[PDB]
Design a protein around this nucleic acid. Structure first.
Ligand SMILES: CN[C@@H]1[C@H](O)[C@H](NC)[C@H]2O[C@@]3(O)C(=O)C[C@@H](C)O[C@H]3O[C@@H]2[C@H]1O
Ligand SMILES: [K+]
Ligand SMILES: [K+]
Ligand SMILES: [Mg+2]
Ligand SMILES: [Mg+2]
Length: 163
RNA sequence: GAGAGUUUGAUCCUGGCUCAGGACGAACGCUGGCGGCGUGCCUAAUACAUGCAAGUCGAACGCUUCUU
């Protein structure tokens, strides 16, 4: 668990989807907002908020995202190793990149990575474009990412021996 | 190793279609200052006026026309 407090979190509105519930009189229109809130230092989360008005949906989503913050391993400006994250339709593949290459990624993955604070990475989305699913798939891949120190500790060998 | 639009009242998935890039012996439209380097019948191996694109050797040979 990562406490939102003590972290200077900033948010970005990934998607604002106007959803409809059909009611006897007609259409009941609501706004569903997907938000990604991150620390630019390795912590990031995503939250969903539904409300009659766009600002309120965004605010609800922001609070949810803070609750869901997670930490991403990072070696320099890029991730430790290649990782594929799959959630539902979403399917993302993210690879380390050389320094200065930038963030090669599309749409929602861009927000997740920027907010997380990763500056250089290569990513490809092999699944659907559904923003919620791709964001979920992104965080799944990041949770798969492993630290050299943790791996070295787990396997019982020095990190130098591992590499 | 970037995506985006579009099926629905709304949603996820599947799925096609379309677009954002680059390329060219290009052509067309509008427009048009210069220079360097390059390229220019992709079609009818269709038909071709005209001129030229294969001559040279007198130290292999015998002739023949003029200059004093
Ligand atoms: C018989 N009275 C109806 C009934 O109460 C409906 N709710 C069950 C009620 O529904 C509404 O309140 C609605 O929300 C829909 C609207 C077409 O009619 C409205 O009035 C509707 C009332 O007129
Ligand atoms: K349509
Ligand atoms: K599609
Ligand atoms: Mg939830
Ligand atoms: Mg020809």
């Amino acid at each position: 668990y990562i406490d939102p407090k003590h972290l200077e979190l900033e948010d970005r509105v990934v998607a604002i989807n106007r959803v409809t519930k059909v009611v006897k009189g007609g259409r009941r229109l609501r706004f569903a907002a997907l938000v990604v809130v991150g620390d630019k230092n390795g912590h990031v989360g995503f939250g969903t908020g539904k409300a009659q008005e766009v600002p309120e949906a965004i605010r609800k989503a922001i609070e949810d995202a803070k609750k869901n913050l997670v930490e991403v391993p990072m070696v320099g400006s890029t991730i430790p190793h290649e990782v594929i994250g799959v959630f539902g339709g979403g399917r993302i593949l993210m690879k380390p990149a050389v320094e200065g290459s930038g963030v090669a990624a599309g749409g929602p993955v861009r927000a997740v990575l920027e907010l997380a604070g990763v500056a250089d990475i290569t990513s490809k989305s092999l699944g659907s474009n559904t923003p919620i699913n791709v964001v979920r798939a992104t965080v799944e891949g990041l949770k798969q990412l492993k630290r050299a120190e943790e791996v070295a500790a787990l396997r019982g060998k020095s990190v130098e021996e591992i590499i």
